[PDB]
């Protein structure tokens, strides 16, 4: 996979052309060509921004721990949430949703993709019977949001993948981040219910977050103050 030259990565081809040319899902311009996102994957973007470990003398002075802000955080999640709400239209289930396959393109518009068993992302009925839907994709699409209220944290950073197959079926959760809103952690929490079809639809989602961008309140805290800490990687 090599970056060439209007900017493309050279390298799924049907998945690509037919699922359209939404703003939301990597595009589509043997050989193929792929739609090139200068910003990379959103997970290391998300901890490129952890300017208190990068830049501690611009962080400290601009009381900030991120160069991202709560409008800017919750935007990539909308971007998500609305990808996703067409892929769910298409009747399209991705299997694979994670903050480390959503690619910061150009004007950074968040977009879905497809690329290298993920155990921290998978929902209960995946993980015990192989079952994927929109449902399961929701339940990942949680673990996403998780990671982009974080800054990139790793989800249930301590446990094992082995340990999470015995702790979730007990109703096991990620705990809510210090610097989450609790509307922003409640709407994680329904991603992640046991029951498939009580999680909410990404519709759904998309609708809360839009809500919650239009407000002109701080829903992720990226302010810095004494006892402040990073949610750990590795
Ligand atoms: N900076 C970049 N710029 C452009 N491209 C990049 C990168 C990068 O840093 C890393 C990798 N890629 C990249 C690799 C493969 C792909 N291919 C795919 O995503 N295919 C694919 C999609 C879907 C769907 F998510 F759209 F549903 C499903 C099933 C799939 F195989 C896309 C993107």
């Known amino acids: 996979v090599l970056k060439a030259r209007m900017d ?32 990379g994957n959103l997970l290391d973007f998300l901890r ?24 800017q955080l919750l935007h990539f999640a ?71 209220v974080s800054l990139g944290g790793t989800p249930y950073c301590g446990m094992t993948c082995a340990e999470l197959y015995e702790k979730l079926p007990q109703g096991y959760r990620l705990e809510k981040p210090l610097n989450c809103d609790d509307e922003v952690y409640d709407l994680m929490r329904q991603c992640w219910r046991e029951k498939p079809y009580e999680r909410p639809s990404f519709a759904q989602i998309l609708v809360s977050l839009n809500r919650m961008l239009e407000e002109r309140k701080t829903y992720v805290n990226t302010t810095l103050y004494e006892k402040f800490t990073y949610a750990g990687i590795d």
């Open 8 to 39: 493309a990565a050279i390298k799924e081809l049907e998945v690509l052309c037919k699922l359209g040319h939404h703003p939301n899902i990597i595009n589509l311009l043997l050989y193929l060509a792929i739609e090139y996102a200068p910003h």
């Open 48 to 71: 490129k921004s952890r300017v208190l470990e990068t830049d501690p003398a611009f962080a400290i002075a601009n009381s900030t721990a991120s160069t991202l802000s709560s409008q």
């Open 78 to 148: 909308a971007d998500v949430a609305r990808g996703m709400d067409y892929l769910s239209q298409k009747q399209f289930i991705h299997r694979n949703l994670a903050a480390r396959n959503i690619l910061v393109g150009e004007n950074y518009v968040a977009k879905i993709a497809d690329f290298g068993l993920p155990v921290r992302w998978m929902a209960i009925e995946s993980l015990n019977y192989s079952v994927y839907t929109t449902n399961s994709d929701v339940w990942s699409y949680g673990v996403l949001l998780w990671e982009i």
